[PDB]
C-alpha cells in the first residue's frame, strides 16, 4: 500500500506570501511552470499553494494543489468535495452580475434548483439537435468567407475578432432559432458579453498589462457590478424575448422565467460562447502546429467520408472520421480549455497519487491545474506531445477515460447528480464540426500565434482552398 506523506508546500508569511505567489502564477514564471517548479521543488504532485486572487477579492487562498491524473479525480466525485460557489476558484463574482441570482454553475448538486437548471440546459441541447448542423455550416461558412477576404486585403486574417461574432450568431440560430442580426442586439453580442465576462474573471487573467498597473486595477479588488448593468441589460431583453420555446419547458420544469432567463444567458454567453472563445483558437494553434501531412490526412478523411455518405454531413457520418475525432480529444487532452477546477473536502480524505497517499481535513480547498493531469506522463506516452491519432482504436479509446476536460472522464456522462459539463457531447459535436467545416474546404494552413488574456490570439496566414 501506498506510504502516507506529509503535505509538502507552504504558504509564506500573511499578505506577502500570497502576494509573491500571486506574482510568480502571473509574471515571472506563468501558471504552468508556477505548478511545474514546485513540483520539482517539493518533489511531490501534490502540495500546499497559494492560489490568486488573495488580495480583497478571495477570503483565503489556500489550496491544496492536486497536480496529476491518479489525485485529480477526486475533484469529480460529489460524495468527498463540495462544488458550492467555488466555479471560479476561492472567490465568487456578485450575483449582482447574474440578476440576483447563484447561477448553475455555481449550485451544488445537493441543491433542487441545481437538476431543476440542469435538465433545462439537457432540454435546450436535446431541442437544438436538428438545428446545430445547418446553422453551424451557414455561420461556418460566412466566417471563412470573411477570413479569406481579410487574408486577400492584409496577407494575414485574425481568427478571434471574426470568429466571436460567428459563434455567437451560430448558437442564437441553434439554441433559440434567431439571427441576432434581426434584434436590437444587432452585431453587438461578442463585445456585451467581453465586458461582463472580464467583470466576472478579472481576479484570475492578465490583460497583458505591466504589473505596477494590472495588480491595482484588477487583481486587488472587484470591478464594479453597476458598469456591466446595462450591457447585461442588452442580453437579458434578447433571451426574455427569444428562448420562448426554451422558457415553456423552463416552467414545465418549475422554474421562474425570470430565474430561467437569467441561467440561459449565462449558460449560451458565459459557459457556451465563453468556452469556444478558447477552445476554438486553441484547436486552430495545435493542429496548425501539426504540420500539411496531418492537415492533408483530415482533409482526405472528412472527403472521403461526406462523399461516402452521399454528401450529407449527419451524426453516423462523423463516427466514421476516426482521425478527425482523435484529433478533438487530443485539442481537448493537450490543452484543456479551463485548467482550474476546485473542490472543498465535505469530510476527512486520503487522497492518493502514484508514489504516495496525503491525508486532508474536512474543509480544506482542493484544486486542480488540469493540464497536469492530462499530460501526466504516468498517465499517457508521449505525453507533452500532441499526437494527431492518440484516440484511434480500440485501444486508443480506452484512454478517454483519462481526458479531463468537462470536468469529468470523457467516458462518463453529465448528470443532475454530478458536476460535469451540461454541454459535454454538444462541444465536442461542435469542435468536431469545426474541424470538418476547415478540412471540407481547405488542404491545409499556416498560422501566426500570439497570447490572450483567454486562450489564444490566432491569424492566419494562409488558407490553401481545395
Ligand atoms: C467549449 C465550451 C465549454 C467548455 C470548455 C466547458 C467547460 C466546463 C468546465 C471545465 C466545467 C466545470 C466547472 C467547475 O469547475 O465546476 C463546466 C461546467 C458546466 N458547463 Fe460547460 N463547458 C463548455 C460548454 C458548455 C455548454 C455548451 C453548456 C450548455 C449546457 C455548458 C454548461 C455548463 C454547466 C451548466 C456547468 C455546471 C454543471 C453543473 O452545475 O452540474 N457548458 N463546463
Ligand atoms: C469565459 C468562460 C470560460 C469557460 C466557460 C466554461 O463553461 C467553464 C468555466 C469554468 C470555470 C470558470 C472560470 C474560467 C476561467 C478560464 C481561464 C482560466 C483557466 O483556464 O483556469
Ligand atoms: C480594466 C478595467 C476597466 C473597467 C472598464 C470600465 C468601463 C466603464
Redesign the pocket.
Request: with cysteine.
Given at each position: 500500500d501506498l506510504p502516507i506523506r506529509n503535505i509538502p508546500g507552504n504558504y509564506g508569511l500573511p499578505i506577502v506570501g500570497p502576494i509573491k505567489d500571486r506574482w510568480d502564477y502571473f509574471y515571472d514564471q506563468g501558471?504552468e511552470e508556477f505548478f511545474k517548479s514546485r513540483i520539482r521543488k517539493y518533489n511531490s504532485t501534490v502540495y500546499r499553494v497559494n492560489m490568486p486572487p488573495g488580495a480583497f477579492i478571495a477570503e483565503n487562498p489556500q489550496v491544496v494543489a492536486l497536480l496529476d491524473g491518479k489525485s485529480f479525480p477526486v475533484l469529480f466525485d460529489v460524495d468527498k468535495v463540495e462544488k458550492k460557489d467555488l466555479?471560479?476558484?476561492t472567490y465568487m463574482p456578485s450575483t449582482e452580475l447574474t440578476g440576483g441570482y447563484r447561477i448553475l454553475?455555481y449550485l451544488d448538486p445537493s441543491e433542487p434548483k441545481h437538476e431543476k437548471l440542469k435538465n433545462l440546459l439537457f432540454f435546450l441541447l436535446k431541442s437544438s439537435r436538428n438545428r446545430i448542423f445547418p446553422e453551424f455550416q451557414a455561420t461556418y461558412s460566412e466566417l471563412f468567407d470573411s477570413l479569406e477576404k481579410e487574408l486577400s486585403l492584409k496577407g494575414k486574417a485574425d481568427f478571434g475578432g471574426s470568429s466571436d461574432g460567428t459563434a455567437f450568431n451560430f448558437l442564437a440560430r441553434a439554441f433559440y432559432g434567431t439571427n441576432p442580426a434581426d434584434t436590437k442586439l444587432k452585431a453587438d453580442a461578442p463585445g456585451l458579453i467581453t465586458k461582463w465576462?472580464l467583470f466576472?474573471?478579472h481576479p484570475?487573467?492578465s490583460i497583458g498589462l505591466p504589473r505596477v498597473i494590472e495588480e491595482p486595477l484588477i487583481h486587488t479588488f472587484s470591478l464594479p457590478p453597476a458598469l456591466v448593468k446595462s450591457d447585461y441589460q442588452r442580453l437579458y431583453e434578447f433571451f426574455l424575448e427569444s428562448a420562448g420555446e426554451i422558457l415553456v419547458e423552463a416552467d414545465k420544469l418549475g422554474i421562474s422565467r425570470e430565474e430561467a432567463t437569467h441561467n440561459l444567458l449565462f449558460a449560451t454567453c458565459?459557459?457556451?460562447?465563453?468556452?469556444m472563445?478558447?477552445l476554438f483558437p486553441n484547436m486552430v494553434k495545435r493542429i496548425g502546429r501539426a504540420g500539411h501531412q496531418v492537415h492533408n490526412r483530415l482533409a482526405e478523411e472528412i472527403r472521403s467520408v461526406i462523399k461516402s455518405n452521399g454528401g450529407e454531413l449527419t451524426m453516423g457520418a462523423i463516427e466514421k472520421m476516426e482521425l478527425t475525432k482523435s484529433v478533438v480529444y487530443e485539442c481537448l487532452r493537450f490543452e484543456?480549455?479551463?485548467?482550474?477546477?476546485y473542490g472543498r473536502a465535505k469530510k476527512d480524505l486520503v487522497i492518493e497519487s502514484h508514489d504516495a497517499a496525503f491525508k486532508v481535513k474536512a474543509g480544506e480547498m482542493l484544486y486542480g491545474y488540469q493540464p497536469l493531469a492530462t499530460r501526466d506522463p504516468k498517465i499517457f506516452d508521449r505525453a507533452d506531445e500532441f499526437v494527431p491519432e492518440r484516440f484511434v482504436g480500440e485501444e486508443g479509446e480506452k484512454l478517454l477515460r483519462h481526458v479531463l476536460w468537462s470536468n469529468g472522464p470523457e467516458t462518463e456522462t453529465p448528470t443532475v447528480g454530478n458536476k460535469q459539463?451540461a454541454?459535454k457531447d454538444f462541444v465536442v459535436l461542435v469542435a468536431r464540426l469545426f474541424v470538418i467545416e476547415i478540412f471540407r474546404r481547405y488542404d491545409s494552413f499556416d498560422i501566426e500565434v500570439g497570447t490572450s488574456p483567454?486562450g489564444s490570439s490566432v491569424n492566419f496566414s494562409s488558407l490553401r482552398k481545395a
Open positions: 501558471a466555479f471560479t476558484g454553475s465576462v466576472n474573471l484570475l487573467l458565459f459557459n457556451t460562447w465563453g468556452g472563445k478558447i484543456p480549455p479551463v485548467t482550474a477546477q459539463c454541454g483567454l
